[PDB]
Amino acid sequence: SDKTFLENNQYTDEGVKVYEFIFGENYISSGGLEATKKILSDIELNENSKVLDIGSGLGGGCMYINEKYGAHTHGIDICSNIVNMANERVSGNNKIIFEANDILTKEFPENNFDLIYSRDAILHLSLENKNKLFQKCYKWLKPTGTLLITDYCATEKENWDDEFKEYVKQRKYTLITVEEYADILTACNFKNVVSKDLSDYWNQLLEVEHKYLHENKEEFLKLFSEKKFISLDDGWSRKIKDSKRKMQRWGYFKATKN
Numbered sequence: 001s002d003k004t005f006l007e008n009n010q011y012t013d014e015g016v017k018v019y020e021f022i023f024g025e026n027y028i029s030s031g032g033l034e035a036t037k038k039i040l041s042d043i044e045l046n047e048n049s050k051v052l053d054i055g056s057g058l059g060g061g062c063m064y065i066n067e068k069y070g071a072h073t074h075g076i077d078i079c080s081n082i083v084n085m086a087n088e089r090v091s092g093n094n095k096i097i098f099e100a101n102d103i104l105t106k107e108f109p110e111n112n113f114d115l116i117y118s119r120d121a122i123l124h125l126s127l128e129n130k131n132k133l134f135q136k137c138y139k140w141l142k143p144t145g146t147l148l149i150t151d152y153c154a155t156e157k158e159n160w161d162d163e164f165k166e167y168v169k170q171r172k173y174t175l176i177t178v179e180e181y182a183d184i185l186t187a188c189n190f191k192n193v194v195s196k197d198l199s200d201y202w203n204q205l206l207e208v209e210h211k212y213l214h215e216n217k218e219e220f221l222k223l224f225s226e227k228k229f230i231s232l233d234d235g236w237s238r239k240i241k242d243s244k245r246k247m248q249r250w251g252y253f254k255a256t257k258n
């Protein structure tokens with residue numbers, strides 16, 4: 001299954017902990033806390049709002065949203081191990097729920113959520129399944145609700161080089177252009193579709209993370225090995241190179257139901 005592939009490779013327990021080291025406590029998404037603050041800076045919610053986080057990871061996004069707004073947050077992630085980790089990070093809070101499930105089969109009521117949020121998770125879905133997911137999101141959103149996404153994107157496939165092809169293949173990502181992604185949202189009937197190519201800002205975030213890794217190498221080596229350091233260091237180096245030249249891109253999408 002896809003679930004097994006993710007839990008046994010990219011998101012093993014150790015893989016997740018290595019990601020958390022560089023992204024920041026409670027995060028496996030780009031830019032950790034600081035990007036979260038920026039991405040939510042123009043979003044309005046309150047204690048009565050209902051939020052779905054698709055690909056909730058270690059839960060930092062939901063923790064932040066609930067802290068900032070007091071909103072009810074429900075995170076779904078297909079990886080059972082990651083959800084177990086997230087659930088160890090929150091207690092005594094009846095407004096934060098993390099659930100291990102496949103978002104493509106999960107049932108939610110129509111007109112349910114004030115915000116559907118997702119951070120660097122939909123890259124795992126095939127193109128067919130991205131379309132299916134966004135159709136479900138449209139239904140699940142309240143008439144007044146907002147969809148807010150960041151995700152890994154890319155230049156057109158014809159332009160990819162050998163190293164980038166191999167990264168995408170090994171990860172089993174489906175990376176499309178920012179423009180194709182926006183077109184899916186438009187085809188699902190979302191309104192006010194705003195897409196931003198945030199590759200430059202992503203490059204900045206990556207540089208901050210890369211510098212952190214380098215400055216904290218000693219501590220990393222005590223927690224994990226030199227082999228894992230090299231892999232992580234080289235992975236960030238390629239992302240920095242490829243975002244600078246817009247081969248690998250970072251897309252931001254915001255849209256509404258009405």
Ligand SMILES: C[N+](C)(C)CCOP(=O)(O)O
Nearest residue numbers: 028029030120121171235
């Ligand atoms: C995709 N993610 C942001 C959840 C984890 C990191 O993936 P990657 O940048 O190592 O490909």
